[PDB]
Amino acid sequence: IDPFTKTSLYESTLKNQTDLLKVTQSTVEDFRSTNQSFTRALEKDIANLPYQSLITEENIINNVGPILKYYRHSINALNVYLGLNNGKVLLSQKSMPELRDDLDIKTKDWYQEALKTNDIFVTPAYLDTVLKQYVITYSKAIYKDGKIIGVLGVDIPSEDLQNLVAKTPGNTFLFDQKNKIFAATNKELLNPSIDHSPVLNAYKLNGDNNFFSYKLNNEERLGACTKVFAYTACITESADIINK
Numbered sequence: 001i002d003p004f005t006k007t008s009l010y011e012s013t014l015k016n017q018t019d020l021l022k023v024t025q026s027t028v029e030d031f032r033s034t035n036q037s038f039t040r041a042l043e044k045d046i047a048n049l050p051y052q053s054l055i056t057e058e059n060i061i062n063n064v065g066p067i068l069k070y071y072r073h074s075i076n077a078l079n080v081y082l083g084l085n086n087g088k089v090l091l092s093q094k095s096m097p098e099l100r101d102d103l104d105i106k107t108k109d110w111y112q113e114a115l116k117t118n119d120i121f122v123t124p125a126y127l128d129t130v131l132k133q134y135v136i137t138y139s140k141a142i143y144k145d146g147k148i149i150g151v152l153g154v155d156i157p158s159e160d161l162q163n164l165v166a167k168t169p170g171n172t173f174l175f176d177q178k179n180k181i182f183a184a185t186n187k188e189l190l191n192p193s194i195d196h197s198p199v200l201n202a203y204k205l206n207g208d209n210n211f212f213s214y215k216l217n218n219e220e221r222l223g224a225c226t227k228v229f230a231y232t233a234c235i236t237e238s239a240d241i242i243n244k
């Protein structure tokens with residue numbers, strides 16, 4: 001009851017929840033940075049091959065192929081590949097890299113977006129054509145002496161990020177670009193019929209990392225969200241810690 005005591009519980013739980021929100025944010029950042037560094041190392045190993053190893057398709061197969069496979073294995077990627085300007089892609093896929101001419105790579109955002117930036121491009125989650133699993137793709141236009149060799153692509157199962165986020169402490173969860181629930185420690189939050197407007201509206205009024213209160217079934221809750229890349233990470237708890 002005493003306003004001194006209520007304030008001290010509010011400050012205390014505010015510190016705990018925002019600490020745990022940061023753990024989930026860091027989880028998403030570390031996932032992306034690990035994958036980007038992997039993709040950069042692979043780009044460098046392909047680009048450092050002699051030109052003779054790169055200028056025929058058969059040489060690409062025999063000299064880039066093993067590299068794609070060793071990298072795929074090292075990180076347990078789903079697919080690792082190099083897309084070429086003739087529309088063919090050298091593909092190293094889970095369950096010997098082959099040159100494929102039937103995957104329409106020039107229509108894929110991971111291909112075309114890599115050509116418009118000098119950075120690694122990261123897709124949202126989407127259904128992989130090759131193995132029919134949801135993936136996040138990291139892609140990168142590879143250049144050697146200013147000449148494009150092709151577009152590197154690395155597919156990581158989006159389930160990997162979901163499991164990483166789910167294992168974090170706290171009632172944390174993650175929205176995707178379309179404000180659709182993407183990951184959650186509490187699996188029940190993945191129910192697609194749940195209305196998330198209360199917590200998203202509270203976030204919209206308060207801003208990144210700013211603790212707020214909101215209502216659920218006429219009961220007070222506390223929470224905070226923050227943008228992480230194009231995701232939105234949130235945490236929420238009951239307000240009983242301050243009220244009881």
Ligand SMILES: CCC[C@H](N)C(=O)O
Binds near residue numbers: 105127135
């Ligand atoms: C070989 C390209 C594979 C990529 N996951 C896609 O669906 O385009």
